[PDB]
Amino acid sequence: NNYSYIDPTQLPYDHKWEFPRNRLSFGKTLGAGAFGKVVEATAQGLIKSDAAMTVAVKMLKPSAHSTEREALMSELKVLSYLGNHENIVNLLGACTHGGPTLVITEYCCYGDLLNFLRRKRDEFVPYKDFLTLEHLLSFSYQVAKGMAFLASKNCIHRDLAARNILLTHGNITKICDFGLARDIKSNYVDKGNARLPVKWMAPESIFNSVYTFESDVWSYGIFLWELFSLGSSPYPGMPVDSKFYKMIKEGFRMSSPEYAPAEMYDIMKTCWDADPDKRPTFKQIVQDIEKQISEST
Ligand SMILES: CCN[C@@](C)(c1ccc(F)cc1)c1cnc(N2CCN(c3ncnn4cc(-c5cnn(C)c5)cc34)CC2)nc1
């Protein structure tokens, strides 16, 4: 075996990213969990030699175990390998010596899309600071372009959902939280023990712990249902129990949201094909949505 796939998480950390810890000033917590949090911060001298830039910083709690610390470094290495794209939350820097790992990313001033949609739900009108159908179509397109970029780098995200899409200036949407993202060299078999986002998962991920380009596409379909339902929770009135799994396996699928264009519901249904081989690729989804936007003009 003289040729092999280069595993981005095995490469050394590139100190071109290194930024002095003592030039980061922490502000409000943006998200938190059992062993970590993300905070807003000011980064003095990060980009502009004399000026401060608002960023986000991901970090573990002091009590975090070694497994969680290695997982944060692995995410930093995946982000370092991926490179830059308009529709992802980009890596800006890292702190690795003098203390625990801090990962510095772009800050998105409007927060996550799910809360944004729920806030805008009452002041939404399909046609024209109100949310409209043109905005929803734009968000669908931008998330599809970000995901096409990830797949073009042979990566899967594994937690695509409206809560992991952020909104920033100019109505630009960015995919965030690469904690579970993987380079898949043709699938990934999760051997972990964590809580899982069951209602966003492809059947083959639930039943066989298998993740692929095609299971990210399933989750994108669920994201589209969240988007055009203005932030409803998927499968309303259905607990995650034995009846849920049985229904999904037999072919049950959600109905169209009221405000989804028929051609966007069509994409949703193909993303949810029981056969992963019949689902569209993100490259095909981008081309589809592009034509819808052009015909909408
Ligand atoms: C599965 C959960 N794991 C953890 C718990 C985790 C943390 C550290 C660890 F070491 C390990 C795990 C986690 C938690 N939270 C995120 N988030 C938060 C949101 N976040 C943002 N990123 C950039 N800008 N930004 C702006 C806003 C915002 C909100 N309101 N407004 C007006 C603006 C929010 C963000 C990215 C992801 N991720 C991970």
Domains in the chain and their CATH numbers?
A: 11-106 (3.30.200.20), 113-289 (1.10.510.10)
Give the integer Cα–Cα distance in Å for 9 and 4: 14
Ligand 1 centroid–CA 30 distance in Å is 5
Return the CA Rg of the chain: 20
Give the integer Cα–Cα distance in Å for 96 and 193: 28
Question: 213-228 vs 282-296: helix axis angle to the nearest 10?
Answer: 30
Catalytic site residue from 14, 122, 159, 275: 159
- Strand-pair partners of 38: 31, 58
For the chain, how far is it from start to end, CA to CA, in angstroms? 53
Experimental determination approach used: X-ray
Give the integer Cα–Cα distance in Å for 145 and 289: 10
Please enumerate in sequence order all residues whose Cβ is within 8 A of that of 251, keeping only pairs 6 or more positions apart, or say none.
274
Taking CA atoms only, the protein residue closest to ligand 1 atom 17 is: 31
Question: Whose CA is closest to 174, among 153, 201, 150, 156?
Answer: 150
Q: Does residue 159 have an active-site annotation?
A: yes
- Alpha helix positions (H), the chain: 66-82, 113-120, 133-152, 203-208, 213-228, 242-250, 262-271, 282-296
Give the integer Cα–Cα distance in Å for 234 and 224: 10
Give the integer Cα–Cα distance in Å for 91 and 43: 13
Ligand 1 centroid–CA 277 distance in Å is 33
The tokens of 34 are what? 């059992």
Question: Whose CA is closest to 213, among 280, 142, 287, 139?
Answer: 280
Give the integer Cα–Cα distance in Å for 108 and 105: 9
Give the resolution to one decimal, in Å: 1.8
CB of 37 sitting under 6 A from ligand 1? yes
Give the integer Cα–Cα distance in Å for 128 and 131: 9
CB of 27 sitting under 6 A from ligand 1? no
